[PDB]
Amino acid sequence: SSILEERILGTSVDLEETGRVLSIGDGIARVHGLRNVQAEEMVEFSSGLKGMSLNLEPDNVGVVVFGNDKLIKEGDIVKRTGAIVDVPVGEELLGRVVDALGNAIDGKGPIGSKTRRRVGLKAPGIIPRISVREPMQTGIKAVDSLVPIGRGQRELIIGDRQTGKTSIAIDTIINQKRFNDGTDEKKKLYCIYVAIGQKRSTVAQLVKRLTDADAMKYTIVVSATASDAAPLQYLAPYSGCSMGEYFRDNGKHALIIYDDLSKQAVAYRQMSLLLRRPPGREAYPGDVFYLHSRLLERAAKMNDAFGGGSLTALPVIETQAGDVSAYIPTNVISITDGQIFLETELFYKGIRPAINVGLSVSRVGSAAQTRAMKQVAGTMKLELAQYREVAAFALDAATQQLLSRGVRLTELLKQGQYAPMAIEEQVAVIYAGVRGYLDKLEPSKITKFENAFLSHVISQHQALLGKIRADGKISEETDAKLKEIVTNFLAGFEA
């Protein structure tokens, strides 16, 4: 009872500058009035809505609304706040779900923040940067061994609909728990997820999936669903990048994900056409390239004079009927540092996740990769490269052995869902395959062997894994041990 009395217990009025509305329709308002108004400045309406001014013309100002427009009507009053649009920032936002402007929608309560930051800022130049040198681990076997990713990089995920793009990011987010539940702060990573254009129930299921694995304690979710106004979907990614930049400048590392960048361009096209600007190709605005180029340039690796922080990005794109030579995808292909391709034909042939290893690339050259993994992955590259060039015809000395090894190697890369692996276990499981210990078993039974052998190795040989983790490389004694373990378990495992 007294709580509400104290809430109402805690009123000043002052002059303000004002314009009057001339017209209103379809979310665009024409305002007569305001004289000393800056470009890209936030204004406020009578009822409580908010807007931003983009067109400054001799006789009127064009204002876009951040919400519904059924309450604005001709003759109303508009005031100017005096500040360019900005969002709250800090580390009190961890574990919360907020909208595009930093308002809680999860029902917990107000957010106690002390800092604000603009959404449109410039990327770091040439001096404050340094090379990329540290690894970013995901838990996917086919990614950590053939398409490695460093800290400070940009990587593209591109494919058709219903191929598996979201689950890669969901698995990547979960894997980071084993580092955040530790001691040293030089190997922790924070995560940010941004949803653009999706429906609410999918986001609810995603949040429930995250909270049952104890991962919400270090994640931030920013959502602008399909029922929101176009300006909010247009503004959402920058509002999340500005939240990510806070960690980068204080010696910490962070990760950000933009889901369906293709759905921001449609909102930009809708917003621009209603402002009476001429169209272009497919009625897109004339500068859709500059919309993403200034966004994907803000991820960088800072040197020691500025702290040593970093920020990583993973955009997502969708293509129509597997057409990679369209308008929008070609723009974003030429900006990033690499891409991962997903296909339906591989999806229906039992290859899940459906990664096309013949086209996926990573322009880092394995500069940031553990020493142990290189020894067993550099040799798997050659095996698969030589397998692909022969084993597709729609002798025994060379050909039969080649595809006998290749069919075994393909089966090793398949993996389940919501279960990433540590690095050393992947090293062991690949070490078993590459050396030829499994060239006798029928390929149909490889997965059961993988599962049983992993469980046995985890339980009975916990001391061996620590050696590989601590040393970072294999040794003669370790190599001696592994052969005996593998041969004995293979002999005993025949069921």
Binding site: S1, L4, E5, I8, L9, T11
Partner: protein
């Protein structure tokens, strides 16, 4: 200030009630009962302090009992 003090006075008037809202509401009790029933159905039926304790035997006991043993 004037509106604030008026609302404070009315909040104190609300506090003057012996118990419950001034307007009990013909449907407030019905809505509360419906919500409680939905919560009970979703969470399952539970008694005040019932603590059952029943222990089963060993399931699928595997032995060496065989003709060749």
């Amino acid at each position: 200030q004037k509106l604030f003090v008026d609302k404070i006075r009315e909040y104190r008037t609300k506090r003057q009630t012996s118990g419950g809202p001034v307007d009990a509401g013909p449907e407030y009790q019905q809505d509360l009962d419906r919500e409680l029933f939905k919560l009970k159905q979703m969470y399952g039926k539970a008694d005040m302090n019932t603590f059952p304790n029943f222990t089963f035997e060993d399931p699928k006991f595997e032995a060496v009992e065989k003709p060749q043993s």
